[PDB]
Amino acid sequence: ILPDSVDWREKGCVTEVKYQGSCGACWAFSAVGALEAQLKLKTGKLVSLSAQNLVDCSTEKYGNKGCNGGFMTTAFQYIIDNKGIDSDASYPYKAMDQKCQYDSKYRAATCSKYTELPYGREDVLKEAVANKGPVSVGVDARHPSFFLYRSGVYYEPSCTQNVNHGVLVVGYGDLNGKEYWLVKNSWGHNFGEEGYIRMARNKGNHCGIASFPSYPEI
Numbered sequence: 001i002l003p004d005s006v007d008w009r010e011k012g013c014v015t016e017v018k019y020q021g022s023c024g025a026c027w028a029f030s031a032v033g034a035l036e037a038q039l040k041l042k043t044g045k046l047v048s049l050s051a052q053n054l055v056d057c058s059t060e061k062y063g064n065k066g067c068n069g070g071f072m073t074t075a076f077q078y079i080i081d082n083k084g085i086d087s088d089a090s091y092p093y094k095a096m097d098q099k100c101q102y103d104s105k106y107r108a109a110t111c112s113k114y115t116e117l118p119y120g121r122e123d124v125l126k127e128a129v130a131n132k133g134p135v136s137v138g139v140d141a142r143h144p145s146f147f148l149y150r151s152g153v154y155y156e157p158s159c160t161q162n163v164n165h166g167v168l169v170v171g172y173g174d175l176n177g178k179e180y181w182l183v184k185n186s187w188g189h190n191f192g193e194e195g196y197i198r199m200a201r202n203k204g205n206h207c208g209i210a211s212f213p214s215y216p217e218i
């Protein structure tokens with residue numbers, strides 16, 4: 001039995017919404033967001049982790065292209081291989097590709113492994129969000145409606161399961177009979193509901209939200 005609604009922000013496991021700017025680092029923000037929650041659950045401290053560290057260091061060897069895109073899963077593996085990721089405070093976000101400047105003296109978190117959920121299973125995603133924590137996911141954000149979203153439960157008739165934008169599911173619930181996934185984006189506070197978007201849930205893997213979900217563990 002799972003709770004009807006979940007919001008990890010109530011549990012103090014979600015940091016301030018970030019602004020990626022003109023740099024395509026959504027994948028990096030998605031990954032650090034997921035790990036930030038695990039760090040809070042393990043140490044009791046909520047700390048924004050360095051998305052820049054991922055953009056600059058989890059590069060070619062991880063199939064990523066910095067400001068031109070990347071994978072949340074390979075980002076997690078980089079953190080594992082590297083034995084750490086720096087804090088955002090020590091390695092600030094500059095919205096541009098830079099030479100890797102990771103330094104263990106600024107390490108704020110570690111990762112031991114990550115898990116990728118089965119393709120398109122929203123019930124499994126619900127279970128992970130309820131029992132494990134925020135989950136990194138990709139969504140189809142190639143439609144105007146996504147950019148113009150302001151409030152309520154987002155539903156786009158033209159959405160597909162071909163995902164291109166990395167975000168973070170930090171909860172789920174329902175608005176007047178309409179089920180949704182609570183998603184943290186990285187487009188600043190002017191986007192949607194002050195940085196968040198509630199996307200249609202249990203509507204046939206709408207916009208591919210449950211297509212490629214993953215979460216790290218410490």
Ligand SMILES: *C(#N)C1([N]C(=O)[C]([C]S(=O)(=O)[C][C]2[C][C]C(=O)[N]2)[N][C](C2=[C][C]=C(F)[C]=[C]2)C(F)(F)F)[C][C]1
Binds near residue numbers: 024068165166212
């Ligand atoms: C953001 N900002 C942008 N997107 C990405 O970096 C996406 C993130 S995603 O959640 O869509 C990843 C998933 C995994 C399976 C899939 O098809 N998308 N990654 C893209 C990407 C990855 C690697 C690369 F070198 C360039 C792009 C994607 F979608 F093609 F995989 C806008 C950057």
